């Protein structure tokens, strides 16, 4: 059926630029267009741009009119978006969207206009005891500290463990970095045989760490 | 820009009873040719946007019987006969009649269920963050309802400020629950300095105050 996978999350320093494709499959790619709409953080959704990679032909919204470029290579099924002159306010999460009236989306690309360093983290266990075992469940987790910038992605055992996991939003602490936890709830009998990794994934520093989470005498 | 109102803001409802949105622009989305163009986006926390309803009243491929829409003019709504847990988002009507195409600013549909009190669990540093020099203690507040929590630390019962963060997940899709955690971050001297590490949780659900602890020593 209809794909839509886009590229994954960057960092990009001020006054620069940035390239974001979106491949497509599943249907005619040259004779559909293809929307690019942004999503400013907590506050509603704006169309940026159309192209029909057919013709080549595009639209853009007065805004980005000459911020944005939209090109498209039907020989890989790819749209994609460049954006100038970046600025701290241009940090977002931009979508690609099929069809004139956005029938299909992508999942999304956060682009972080900023001059920070870019940062993995450090995974750390929040390991399981009498202290977090409630009647007859068991509750584990990874503290995923200090990377910068967003997003971090977490998995338990590969993706096979998702049921009653809880990947709470990061906050920002003082220095400017972001924090975050993943618990899950399990049975307590379980933990003397069941094995229990979290899998964090920090896409803007190609990081990807898994740590083994393993009961603790408390 | 022909702007997009959307109405309410924000709307909770209990699971079953029905829920209404407006979304009122400024001209006409009714095409010269027999056709208005007006959709409804239904947006997760976190996720990417899935169409629900286009051209005003066309649904879309696998998508619920309690979903309707209609309206017209300038006054579209959408409607939900029988609100349920997995209805939570934020949903938004989108304009594609006109010059450049423009949202509503959305509307948050929480579902209002019954009082569960929180379960409540604490975990102590890991020794490899300590070697690292800082020591994590986290708080974790799982499947309650409602959202409002008051969580307190206490080392050896000294109430404690300024030194822990928090964070409240969305909603849950399933039993409508949220979940909480609070975060105690400081120096491992400082860790070492002290013996009894207490978070104390306040919750509508809970008759009396509870409070998770542990000896840093036996630990």
């Known amino acids: 059926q209809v794909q839509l996978v886009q590229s994954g999350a960057e960092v990009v320093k001020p006054g620069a630029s940035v390239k974001v494709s979106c491949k497509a499959s599943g249907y005619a790619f040259s004779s559909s267009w293809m929307n690019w709409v942004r999503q400013a953080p907590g506050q509603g959704l704006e169309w940026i741009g159309r192209?029909?990679?057919?013709?080549?032909?595009?639209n853009y919204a007065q805004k980005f009119q000459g911020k944005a470029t939209l090109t498209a290579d039907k020989s890989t099924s790819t749209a994609y978006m460049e954006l100038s002159s970046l600025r701290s306010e241009d940090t977002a999460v931009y979508f690609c969207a099929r069809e004139y009236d956005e029938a299909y989306w992508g999942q999304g690309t956060l682009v972080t206009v900023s001059s920070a360093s870019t940062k993995g983290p450090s995974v750390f266990p929040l390991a399981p005891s009498s202290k977090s075992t409630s009647g007859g469940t068991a509750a584990l987790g990874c503290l995923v500290k200090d990377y910068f910038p967003e997003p971090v992605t977490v998995s338990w055992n590969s993706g096979a463990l998702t049921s009653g996991v809880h990947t709470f939003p990061a906050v920002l602490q003082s220095s400017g970095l972001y924090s975050l936890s993943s618990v899950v709830t399990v049975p307590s009998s379980s933990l003397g045989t069941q094995t229990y990794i979290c899998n964090v994934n920090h896409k803007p520093s190609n990081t990807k760490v898994d740590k083994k989470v393993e009961p603790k005498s408390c | 820009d022909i702007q997009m109102t959307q109405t309410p803001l924000s709307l909770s409802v209990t699971p079953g009873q029905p829920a209404s949105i407006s979304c009122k622009s400024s001209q006409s989305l009714l095409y010269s040719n027999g056709k208005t163009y007006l959709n409804w986006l239904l947006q997760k926390p976190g996720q990417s946007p899935k169409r629900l309803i286009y051209l005003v009243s066309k649904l879309d491929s696998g998508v619920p019987d309690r979903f309707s829409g209609s309206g017209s003019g300038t006054d579209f709504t959408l409607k939900i006969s029988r609100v349920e847990a997995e209805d939570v988002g934020v949903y938004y009507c989108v304009q594609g009649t006109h010059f450049p195409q423009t949202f509503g600013g959305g509307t948050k549909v929480e579902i209002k269920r019954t009082v569960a009190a929180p379960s409540v669990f604490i975990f102590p540093p890991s020794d490899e963050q300590l070697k690292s020099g800082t020591a994590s203690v986290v708080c974790l507040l799982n499947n309650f309802y409602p959202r409002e929590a008051k969580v307190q630390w206490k080392v050896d019962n000294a109430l404690q400020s300024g030194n822990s963060q928090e964070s409240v997940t969305e909603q849950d899709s399933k039993d409508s629950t949220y979940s909480l955690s609070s975060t105690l971050t400081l120096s491992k001297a400082d860790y070492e300095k002290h013996k009894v590490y207490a978070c104390e949780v306040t919750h509508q659900g809970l008759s009396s105050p509870v409070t998770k602890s542990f000896n840093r020593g036996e630990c």
């Open positions: 192209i029909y990679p057919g013709d080549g032909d595009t």
